Amino acid sequence: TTALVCDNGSGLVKAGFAGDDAPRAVFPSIVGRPRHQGVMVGMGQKDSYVGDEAQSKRGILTLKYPIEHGIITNWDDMEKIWHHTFYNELRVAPEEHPTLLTEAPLNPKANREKMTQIMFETFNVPAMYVAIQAVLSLYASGRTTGIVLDSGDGVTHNVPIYEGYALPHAIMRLDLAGRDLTDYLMKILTERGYSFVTTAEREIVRDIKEKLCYVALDFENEMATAASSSSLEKSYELPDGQVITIGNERFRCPETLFQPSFIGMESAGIHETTYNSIMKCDIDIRKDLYANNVMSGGTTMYPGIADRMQKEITALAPSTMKIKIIAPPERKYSVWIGGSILASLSTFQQMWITKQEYDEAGPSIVHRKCF
Template sequence: MSNNIVVLDNGGGLIKAGQGGECDPLVVIPNCLFKPLSSKKFIFPPPLSHGADVDIDLTSAAVRRPIDRGYLINPDLQRDIWSHLFTSLLRITPTSSSLLLTEPPLSIPSVQRATDELVFEDFGFSSLYLANPQSLVHLYEASRRPGSILSRTQCSLVVDCGFSFTHAVPVLHNFTLNHAIKRIDLGGKAFTNYLKELVSYRSINVMDQTFLMDDAKEKLCFVSLHLHRDLNLARERRNGNVIKSTYVLPDGVTHTKGYVKDPQSAMNFLTLGLSDEGPNTLLDTKLDNVERKKADMNKNEIDLTNERFLVPETLFQPADLGMNQAGLAECIVRAVSSCHSYLQPVLYQSIILTGGSTLFPQLKERLERELRPLVPDHFDVKIITQEDPILGVWRGGSVLASSPDFESMCVTKAEYEELGSARCRRRFFH
């Protein structure tokens, strides 16, 4: 078996790929093809330098994704994206490489078979290990915190808010407790779509501006610590400037990307969080003395006020989108309550937030406030945020791939050909 191990975190929004044992992935690319207005055909997205924008005009770009609502629905499209990734970006030979591939929890058999066919039949990898993303996050954080209760007990609750779903997953000794997994059908894609609807209803039609609204969401949305106060602020003309931000759309000439008009004022909401009573007087005075920068519709500018916190608010109140599902805090409590009573106090002390949608400012603080009344008083609640929640899964995969036991845990191509997909997958306890 080859020592060349490719770690592939195949998310619905982003693919993170690189060599096992490294600190960071070599490549991060959107898991899609898109067609800008300047192109006659769908093209492969260029790699992202992590945290940077795609260097291409994506105004009104069409997009095709192989994964929808967390499931692989277009294996042919995924094959094309992987082929580009392996050949042009990673420059690896699959037939002489092992693959560590992530797969969301509770995947259905037809998707599992399609994935195995891609790995072994289309690309001919020499061996495969399928990993649950949440178990990799647990592994990574346990390796980073050797003296913590998480590491000592080898038990945690991983809250993974990604592109398609939000999962609350109890993990024990690197295995997910599948019977206790709880899911909310909300993720980054749903948040972006909701922002598009709100902006389109209130100002200009941006329903075909997926990438622009995704950028606006990432730069401007935040979790409210005082919902009713912030709603009132957004309604008031004078104090509304504490919440209001202007996002400038591309004009295709001077700039091909959207941007925040006044980034500093966009951060004023963080000062509000210092007071439970409302905005502080000093901040109001400063804002009154600052020249207001109003949106100019002739320049394709849009004002965002309560949209900034109403979008992430749906994670705590899915009913706002007409969904009959529990919010994040209750979802966590249900997951913990489904576990053995001996594990429950440990799980509440080792809640790990991961996934790109946990980057909303103030999410951790809001979750702590919502959880505390729902958790028994004699249990401590501790929430851990990852240093980079987008790369946390991949880094855990890299740690696992560098383990001396990794090769013995894999299914080889010969075993797959002899036993088939279903029997091979028993190796991974799925």
């Protein structure tokens, strides 16, 4: 049989079949419900919308994310999204395909316990497995050694791995990702008179961020350049025809990744977090870690972020060390690619958690059989 790989991210859902190069279904992980009363009978009206249908009708819906900071908060909507993924997007029967799921490190245990329970009861999957997202990214990188910086919509985390061995004590996790940057961009757009308060407007600001934001090599010099002339100004057309122009907000929004104090957080930036994760490892592997910095996720797709990370790590690392940032063009799907590679391995087939084992042991078996 063919195995299923499902990367349930905070923002997007990636699904497909093991052995493929790219996921087949990529749709937003949103559930939308009407906030206005219907007046016209005879047309199909649903109580909820999932995914692209929710995005298309977002003008009359309230959009709610069931996953927040890599933690599932609404299990009803999560089950709806899983049903949608299994039936309307993949056109498969979950009872005939083992499914591989992903999760961020340092997550609550009940999250994966309930994921296993839902998989084994609601959908009757013959076997399932929960992997750590950064490990899959390293699988997709074709490497057994390196520190992975995976930053998506909810969670930014660091996992150092050397010769296939992970160092759990050096694992870093920070709840600062694309959604926080979108909210900060919404906050800072009010300085030019642009107001976005609803969820659909949040989806518009997210699109603006995806299409106009970039990371500046030097923040203060970029600010001076923006305050000096209008070369950095760009225009964006709203869906109603309105045109907005933004200046320094293009690079101020992703600067929060390196200066978390912009949103009131006391934590250090991603570069200092990676440096601290490297320094917590054994001294004999830091040289290999310095040259194998792997970035994955949507939040790593900002233009010029790899150069900024390389500059900061070089400024933090000793001069004799060689710093190399690895940013493949397809890093937005590295987790799914690595999951498919893992599920397509012959040696992995003995690591599946089957229905009989779950019945014998209960939901607690996921802690034993999964890292």
